[PDB]
Structures are given as C-alpha cells and as structure tokens.
Design a binder for this molecule. Structure first.
Ligand SMILES: [Ca+2]
Ligand SMILES: [Ca+2]
Lengths: 223, 223
C-alpha cells in the first residue's frame, strides 16, 4: 500500500499471510479453520501465518499452519479475474485470541460512500520496489459503480467493486493481493486487481464478497 | 520483467540504473554525458550507475556519476503520463567502452510487428514481490495501435505505443520503469505504464520516442 500508515500492533487480528518460502498474498480468517483469499493467489503448497505484525521477525504471538485443502471458485476466470475468490482449509484449528481473531461475512452489500480499511504487506513505493516489514493500513471509501466503470471501461462485472481515490496517490498494490477490505465490521472485498502503486491516482478493483456468502457457507459445510 | 530471461553479462551496454539509496528506475545512455528516462522517475538527487549486471555486487566494470541537471519534458502530464520523457546531464563524461556504450535515436517510427528488447531490474513475480540482482531481458513485438486502445480505452495518445503480449504471462513491471526498449538498433520506447506484473496478459504502454528526436537534440545543444 502506498500513501498509507503503519497499522497499530495487532489492530487487524483477522489478517493472515500466505507464504510459500516468501510472503506473496494476504487473506482473512473467517473461522478457526478456514481462510478466504483471492483465487489468483493459488499455489499447490501454502503455509498460513497468523498473528503477525513484523513479517520478518518472530514476535512470539504467531501461529503457522499448513493448508490441508485449497478450493478455488469453480467459475474463476484467469483472464478477467472474474469470481476471483478462493477458500483455504487449515490442517489444524488455530487458537483464537486477541492477536488472532476472525471477521464477519457481509449481511448485505455495502452502499457507495461506505468507509473501509485495507491492510497488507504489499509494495509501498510509486517508483521502485519496497516490501515493508510492518503491516500497512489505508482508509478508503467505496466509489459508485459509475466511477468504477470510468477508470476500467467495459471491464467491470457484477462481482467486482471499486474502492480508492482518483487523486492523492494512495492505493493498494501487489503484495496486498488477496488481503481483506473491512467496512462496518464486515468483510466486503478482497484485493483483486488495479493499476496499483504505479498509478496511485486511480481506484482499485476488489471482489464483491456479498455475492458469495451462500457459496462460502455451503463449501465450509461439505468439506 | 515477468516470464523473461537473465540477459547475457553486459549484452545491454546502454542500460543504466537510477539510484537514490536504492534502485528505482532504469534509463538509457545516449552520449557520454546524457541519459534518457521517464519523467515520472524524476527525483531531486539521482546517481546514475553504469556498466552493471549484478546490481547488488561490485563486478569491476562499473561507473557511478551524479546528475548535474535533470530536465523533464515541459508538457509532462502526471495524470495521464503523456509526454513521459526526461533527460539527465551527468556531472562528468563517462568513459565509454565495451561494458558502457550508447544507443541510437530513431531515424523513423517503428511499424507494428517489429521485434524489440526490453531490459530492467524490475519486479519478476505476478504474485508477491521480487527484485532480481541480474538484469532481466524480454523480447516482445510492437503492437498495432488498435490492440492498445482495446486494453486501455480512451487513454492512448499519439505519444504512446504498445509493446507486449495478450497472453503468455510476460510483461514489464515496476522497477523496469524508464527502462530502454530497443528495436532495430534504435531506442523506440521508454517503459512508462501499464498493468505490469499483476496482469501480465496485457500489453504495456511506452513513450513513443520517435516523436521527440528534435526536442532531445535542441535540449542537448542548449545545455
Ligand atoms: Ca512475525
Ligand atoms: Ca554491480
């Protein structure tokens, strides 16, 4: 994330780190054995790291659990990143506490103007590259669909929602991908795609989670 | 660069590295005292590093010179990245050899279909972040304008030009910015903007250098 601020130590307990030798994506704990992330962050061998602030140092309040089953959305479109959502089942239930806690699924779709929080260890520079140690945060509204269409003409489906600014040079970036977007105590989006750190003067596009509540539930039931 | 190959040691003698504590962009040597880069790669204090292959190890055939004057194109538009070109005067003439050489300015605009080479120490992963040590290379064609329009509707001006693929997971990325793009022994483009590593299945857009040969010349003459 560019133009954001270092989050308060463990202020985002539902944030996890998808690691495969190195951190590559973010996700969210939805229960003591299931994590939600972006489908494009799929890998055959994934280790989930929870309760972490400084991703490059062992603080003591962390938990590392391997993935036992990774389930992408049947209709995931790698070309248009449509239906860009994936569920991950942990090999062992994680011991929930203050540092490691869940996040609620949307009871409804958040209307335009709603304020949200974006987190992750993505790139923080507009020119060059820099992988922060500490978890970065950014407060950004949920732009109307009209604004979403203007920036990415004819590329927005019903399962996508824009969040960000049109100026100010603040936005999500690669590394933050698959990471949570919480609006009003609920998970409303998943860092999917957009111009990123390079063109911060454009809103980003996220998966519209309020559309998959049924799927998530039925999946968690049958597995 | 993603889905590229590690260039042969010193096979790109015109590639420079804009460093300001850390590598942040690339550029091209056009004479013993001038370098060309992207206007968005503008910084108040830049040190140009020449004759490099392994950006993190001193190899012996290197030269470091400070920027004595940085000239951005008067009409640079930071919002649309139009006229994204900038010139850099070095503090001392560099000693040209086999490892440190120049590259010619376009005698004409390259037509679609032409093959080009893109080099840089930019990001190399589509998920996560990775700054390579060795200079990466990529061979890509110059696409018809039509192909550029479709990807970036109404965002292409007469001063930009598309290069890349529509699939194969190969593309330029942040870090490669301001980086050369040689076609037929001449500099035809400058790494400007595009979806980058995130969505490699999209062509990148570069500055059309063949439109600024006069500007470059008059600028070098007056300074
Ligand atoms: Ca840690
Ligand atoms: Ca070196």
């Amino acid at each position: 994330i560019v133009g954001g601020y270092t989050c308060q130590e463990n202020s985002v307990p539902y944030q996890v780190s998808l690691n495969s030798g190195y951190h590559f994506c973010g996700g969210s704990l939805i229960n003591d054995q299931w994590v939600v992330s972006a489908a494009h962050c799929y890998k055959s061998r994934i280790q989930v790291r929870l309760g972490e602030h400084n991703i490059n140092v062992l603080e003591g309040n962390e938990q590392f659990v391997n993935a036992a089953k990774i389930i992408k959305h049947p209709n995931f479109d790698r070309k248009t990143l449509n239906n860009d959502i994936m569920l991950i089942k942990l090999s062992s239930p994680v011991k929930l506490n203050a540092r490691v806690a869940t996040v609620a699924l949307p009871s409804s779709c958040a209307p335009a103007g709603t304020q949200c929080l974006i987190s992750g260890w993505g790139n923080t520079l507009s020119s060059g590259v820099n992988e922060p140690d500490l978890l970065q945060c950014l407060d950004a509204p949920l732009l109307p669909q009209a604004d979403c269409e203007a920036s990415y003409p004819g590329k927005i489906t019903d399962n996508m929602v824009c969040v960000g600014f049109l100026e100010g040079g603040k936005s999500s970036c690669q590394g933050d991908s698959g990471g949570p977007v919480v609006c009003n105590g609920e998970l409303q989006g998943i860092v999917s795609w957009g111009y990123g750190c390079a063109l911060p003067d454009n809103p980003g596009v996220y998966t519209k989670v309020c559309n998959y509540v049924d799927w998530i539930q039925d999946t968690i039931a049958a597995n």
